[PDB]
Amino acid sequence: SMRDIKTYLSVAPVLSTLWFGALAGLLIEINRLFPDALSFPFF
Amino acid sequence: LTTSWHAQLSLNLAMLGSTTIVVAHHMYSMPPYPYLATDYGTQLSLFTHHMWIGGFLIVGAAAHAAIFM
Amino acid sequence: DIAGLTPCKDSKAFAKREKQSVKKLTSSLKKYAPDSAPALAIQATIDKTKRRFENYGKFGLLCGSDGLPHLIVSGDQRHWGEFITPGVLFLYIAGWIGWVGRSYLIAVSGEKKPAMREIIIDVELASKIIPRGFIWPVAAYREWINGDLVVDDADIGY
Amino acid sequence: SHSVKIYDTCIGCTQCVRACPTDVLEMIPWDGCKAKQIASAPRTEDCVGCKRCESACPTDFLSVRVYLGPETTRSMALSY
Amino acid sequence: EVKIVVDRDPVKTSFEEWARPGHFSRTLAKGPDTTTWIWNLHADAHDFDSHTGDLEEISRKVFSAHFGQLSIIFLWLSGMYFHGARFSNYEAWLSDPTHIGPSAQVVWPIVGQEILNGDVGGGFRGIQITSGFFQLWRASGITSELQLYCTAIGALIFAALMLFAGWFHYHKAAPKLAWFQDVESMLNHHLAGLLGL
Amino acid sequence: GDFLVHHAIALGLHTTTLILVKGALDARGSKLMPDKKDFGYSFPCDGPGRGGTCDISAWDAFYLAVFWMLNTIG
Amino acid sequence: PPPIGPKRGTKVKILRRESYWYNGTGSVVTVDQDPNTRYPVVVRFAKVNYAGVSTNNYALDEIKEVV
Ligand code: CLA
Ligand code: CLA
Ligand code: CLA
Ligand code: CLA
Ligand code: CLA
Ligand SMILES: CCCCCCCCCCCCO[C@H]1O[C@H](CO)[C@@H](O[C@H]2O[C@H](CO)[C@@H](O)[C@H](O)[C@H]2O)[C@H](O)[C@H]1O
Ligand SMILES: CCCCCCCCCCCCO[C@H]1O[C@H](CO)[C@@H](O[C@H]2O[C@H](CO)[C@@H](O)[C@H](O)[C@H]2O)[C@H](O)[C@H]1O
Numbered sequence: 001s002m003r004d005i006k007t008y009l010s011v012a013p014v015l016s017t018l019w020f021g022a023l024a025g026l027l028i029e030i031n032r033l034f035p036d037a038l039s040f041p042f043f
Numbered sequence: 044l045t046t047s048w049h050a051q052l053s054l055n056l057a058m059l060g061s062t063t064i065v066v067a068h069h070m071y072s073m074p075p076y077p078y079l080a081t082d083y084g085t086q087l088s089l090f091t092h093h094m095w096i097g098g099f100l101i102v103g104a105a106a107h108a109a110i111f112m
Numbered sequence: 113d114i115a116g117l118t119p120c121k122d123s124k125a126f127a128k129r130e131k132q133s134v135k136k137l138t139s140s141l142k143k144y145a146p147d148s149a150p151a152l153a154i155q156a157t158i159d160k161t162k163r164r165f166e167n168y169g170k171f172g173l174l175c176g177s178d179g180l181p182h183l184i185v186s187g188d189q190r191h192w193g194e195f196i197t198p199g200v201l202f203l204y205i206a207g208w209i210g211w212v213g214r215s216y217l218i219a220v221s222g223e224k225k226p227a228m229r230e231i232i233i234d235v236e237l238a239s240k241i242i243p244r245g246f247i248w249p250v251a252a253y254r255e256w257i258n259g260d261l262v263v264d265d266a267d268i269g270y
Numbered sequence: 271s272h273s274v275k276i277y278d279t280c281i282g283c284t285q286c287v288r289a290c291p292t293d294v295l296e297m298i299p300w301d302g303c304k305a306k307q308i309a310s311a312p313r314t315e316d317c318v319g320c321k322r323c324e325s326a327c328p329t330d331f332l333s334v335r336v337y338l339g340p341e342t343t344r345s346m347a348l349s350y
Numbered sequence: 351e352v353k354i355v356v357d358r359d360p361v362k363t364s365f366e367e368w369a370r371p372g373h374f375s376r377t378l379a380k381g382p383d384t385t386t387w388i389w390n391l392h393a394d395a396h397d398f399d400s401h402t403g404d405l406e407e408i409s410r411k412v413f414s415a416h417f418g419q420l421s422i423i424f425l426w427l428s429g430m431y432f433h434g435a436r437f438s439n440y441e442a443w444l445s446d447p448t449h450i451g452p453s454a455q456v457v458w459p460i461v462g463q464e465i466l467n468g469d470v471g472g473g474f475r476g477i478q479i480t481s482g483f484f485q486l487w488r489a490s491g492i493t494s495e496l497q498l499y500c501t502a503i504g505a506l507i508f509a510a511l512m513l514f515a516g517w518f519h520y521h522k523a524a525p526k527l528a529w530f531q532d533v534e535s536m537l538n539h540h541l542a543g544l545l546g547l
Numbered sequence: 548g549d550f551l552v553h554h555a556i557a558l559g560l561h562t563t564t565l566i567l568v569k570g571a572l573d574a575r576g577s578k579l580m581p582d583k584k585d586f587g588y589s590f591p592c593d594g595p596g597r598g599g600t601c602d603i604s605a606w607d608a609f610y611l612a613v614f615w616m617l618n619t620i621g
Numbered sequence: 622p623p624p625i626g627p628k629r630g631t632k633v634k635i636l637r638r639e640s641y642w643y644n645g646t647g648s649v650v651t652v653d654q655d656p657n658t659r660y661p662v663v664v665r666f667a668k669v670n671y672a673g674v675s676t677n678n679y680a681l682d683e684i685k686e687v688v
Contacts, residue, residue, distance in 0.1 A: 041171050
């Protein structure tokens with residue numbers, strides 16, 4: 001059921017996998033846009 | 044041998060593990076594929092890989108024979 | 113300058129390293145057709161290398177005798193971009209994560225079997241608490257003032 | 271020989287006596303608990319020091335305690 | 351006699367059990383009191399013999415799990431053939447085996463990892479392989495990337511077939527205990543049908 | 548390089564001190580073994596009950612700390 | 622004769638040093654009325670100890686009533 005599939009998608013390993021995948025994607029895209037940074041130059 | 048999965052697993056693991064070591068010994072000395080013998084990296088890799096696999100299977104045989112006992 | 117170091121925009125060893133890297137890349141580039149994909153990839157790498165060296169030069173970093181950038185973390189106001197500002201960012205993000213975790217643990221402890229909500233997350237509840245990390249420095253400070261952050265030593269026990 | 275002691279927090283559940291592998295312990299009448307019995311250790315020259323009795327005890331903290339002592343043929347479980 | 355006997359619809363396909371970790375164990379189904387529970391859940395997962403003392407149920411579970419392993423192996427082979435067809439220098443290697451290094455893995459250019467795309471020859475840059483797939487493919491008469499694509503597609507279809515067969519032979523039609531204990535017929539089929547043919 | 552190696556040496560000092568201090572301050576007892584002082588400085592264990600109690604005495608803490616001492620001095 | 626000990630459902634605090642739940646709280650289940658019983662108060666806890674037990678017996682001078 002929708003209730004049961006929503007319950008199964010909330011278990012700890014599945015949620016960890018999704019969270020870390022999204023975070024890794026964000027970090028990869030940021031490093032593709034502003035590469036080779038050793039400091040904060042904006043201000 | 045018709046009522047215990049563990050005993051069958053023990054015997055079969057031992058046989059497959061020993062067979063893999065035989066395969067590793069025979070494939071270096073009678074290279075069956077073209078342009079394999081002079082690709083030194085591939086030969087070394089195949090020999091080492093199948094040695095490791097056979098060792099692990101042989102150990103598993105003892106584990107599951109103990110489970111039977 | 114500071115500690116006998118030299119700015120990277122005026123260092124001969126820095127420019128030597130840049131030239132050596134570019135020459136090493138160009139030697140590989142000279143092996144393929146001009147319009148092939150490997151040639152374009154190597155050219156993109158060369159442009160990226162030049163951009164990296166230029167940005168390091170013009171962002172005010174200091175270079176040692178080896179010709180490599182060195183970081184200053186003593187508090188000097190000419191180098192806050194190296195440690196202090198990113199450090200503030202790290203502390204802000206870490207405080208957000210910790211604050212939302214603690215608030216979830218406190219909100220969930222009132223149930224009949226709280227442990228069941230620790231291996232299976234209540235996403236509906238967590239989605240109302242996640243946005244509140246935005247102002248964690250204010251909430252934590254006010255909680256500390258009113259004596260809601262800490263438990264007395266006499267009350268600690270299994 | 272090892273030393274075995276019984277303390278007055280015993281509830282007379284008899285699990286330690288059932289767990290012992292060389293018959294060291296036994297139950298005797300008592301009036302201090304609802305079960306009207308308590309454990310006893312009269313044959314500690316046959317103790318090997320395995321501590322199964324401690325594993326079986328349900329009270330917190332334990333009501334039966336084993337202190338290892340000087341070793342003998344019986345306490346080292348030597349068949350030769 | 352040696353006859354094909356099964357039971358129809360033994361287990362109902364439902365999502366109820368997926369929401370109850372530890373369902374297979376009577377001592378794990380309660381829920382956790384300590385962290386140890388979590389470790390136990392993974393340690394006792396495939397120990398079917400301890401779940402129950404019924405031989406037939408153990409045999410049925412074993413059969414279904416073996417089908418699952420075959421599905422995974424087919425996925426692995428499909429991946430190998432597709433990567434050989436799409437991201438390799440096999441065609442160039444066919445014309446100069448002694449001077450070109452085989453390669454079938456390439457990487458994306460981020461954080462400087464593209465240096466791992468080495469100069470292996472034949473106008474190609476990548477990671478050199480030692481599994482020996484190129485020699486096996488040459489010994490099979492393969493000369494084109496389209497053939498490798500077709501083999502990869504076939505392997506994907508076979509993986510789907512194995513997974514569906516696992517589902518069917520567990521949840522729909524499960525063989526009886528007498529079916530598994532026909533060792534004479536199993537030996538006859540696996541000596542002659544499998545190895546000989 | 549001197550900066551990095553000095554912070555490594557500091558790590559060694561702090562961890563060795565942790566091991567030895569935990570050994571000393573828990574010698575008389577803890578939650579897992581509240582009556583430890585009756586058994587003396589060096590004893591094998593307290594058996595497999597209560598989850599298992601391997602390496603629970605203070606002598607064992609000294610034994611563990613000697614490895615970290617050798618690492619740090621190395 | 623007056624019944625001894627706190628009533629059922631009372632929240633109590635543990636004072637026995639060697640207990641797992643020392644300085645914690647628990648709920649009274651029952652009190653034994655036999656004058657010969659040395660540890661008559663039965664207490665139940667939310668968390669299990671290292672042996673997996675969640676109930677224990679105590680004397681009247683080892684527990685304090687918390688309101
Ligand atoms: C403790 C160890 C450590 C540290 C401190 C670093 C630090 C760094 N590494 Mg290294 N690294 C490490 C371990 C470490 N590394 C390890 C173990 C490995 C091997 C796995 C690597 C492999 C590695 C590689 C391959 C690379 C680095 C790079 C970097 C740099 C990344 C900078 C960046 O991406 O900025 C940009 C990122 C951010 C600003 C993060 C933003 C995070 C979120 C989105 C912020 C959102 C804020 C939000 C808007 C709220 C604020 C607003 C407010 C008003 C509310 C940095 C100097 C990269 C580099 O360029 O080095 C020079 C690089 O190429 N590292
Ligand atoms: C056909 C092969 C086969 C099969 C079907 C089984 C089946 C079984 N074995 Mg046996 N076994 C085998 C081979 C096999 N074994 C071999 C080769 C060995 C020798 C090493 C053993 C040694 C062995 C032992 C010692 C035990 C079993 C047990 C078991 C049972 C439970 C397994 C379980 O739940 O694992 C669950 C699986 C895990 C918790 C994950 C294990 C992951 C491993 C340890 C590491 C993998 C690392 C990977 C290669 C690299 C990743 C790196 C990356 C993540 C960074 C089950 C009946 C256990 C039992 O109780 O039997 C009654 C048991 O105690 N087996
Ligand atoms: C809610 C999360 C949380 C919070 C607020 C704290 C807070 C604290 N921990 Mg703890 N810790 C946590 C989780 C947390 N911990 C977990 C999951 C572990 C298991 C690995 C530990 C293991 C641990 C150790 C071993 C130690 C601490 C220590 C500390 C203290 C100093 C900070 C430190 O060293 O952190 C370091 C901790 C980590 C790097 C562990 C990872 C923390 C994760 C990222 C927290 C968030 C994860 C969580 C699943 C998020 C849920 C979100 C929610 C909306 C559902 C501080 C009281 C230290 C102490 O005692 O200082 C006096 C100490 O020695 N923690
Ligand atoms: C169509 C989907 C479906 C559904 C809804 C169910 C539902 C059910 N099945 Mg059935 N089953 C299915 C398909 C399905 N099954 C298939 C395709 C097979 C053949 C393999 C089986 C074989 C099977 C068996 C043998 C058993 C069940 C059982 C169950 C019950 C518990 C399931 C559970 O705990 O899942 C949650 C479990 C998982 C998600 C485990 C993961 C499984 C995947 C395939 C493993 C992947 C491994 C991974 C790739 C390795 C690498 C990891 C990493 C290192 C990269 C439940 C009634 C059990 C039952 O009825 O017990 C009384 C039982 O014993 N099923
Ligand atoms: C000639 C007939 C025949 C063939 C070809 C096979 C083939 C196989 N059997 Mg055996 N089996 C047979 C008859 C046969 N069996 C009979 C008569 C019985 C009853 C006594 C059994 C009972 C039996 C059991 C209990 C098990 C096997 C298993 C296996 C597999 C062993 C692993 C392997 O080498 O995979 C090599 C892989 C391949 C060659 C690729 C797959 C190719 C397809 C899928 C082969 C399909 C064969 C099958 C007979 C088709 C029937 C279709 C029809 C019902 C519509 C393998 C697929 C084991 C297994 O893993 O099962 C899943 C297993 O546990 N068999
Ligand atoms: C716990 C105990 C902590 C003790 C911390 C003590 C910190 C003392 C810091 C004193 C800093 C005084 O300032 C010292 O650094 C400044 C850079 O940051 C220098 O400033 C320099 O760079 C500035 C950049 O805007 C220029 O405007 C100045 O003309 C130039 O001199 C000062 O010339 C120097 O005197
Ligand atoms: C550069 C930075 C300089 C900062 C200077 C200002 C510092 C201000 C410190 C405020 C401390 C607030 O917290 C401090 O008092 C609280 C009471 O008010 C204490 O709270 C304690 O007493 C309260 C009753 O008064 C109880 O309700 C709490 O349960 C108890 O924990 C905190 O345990 C203590 O840490």
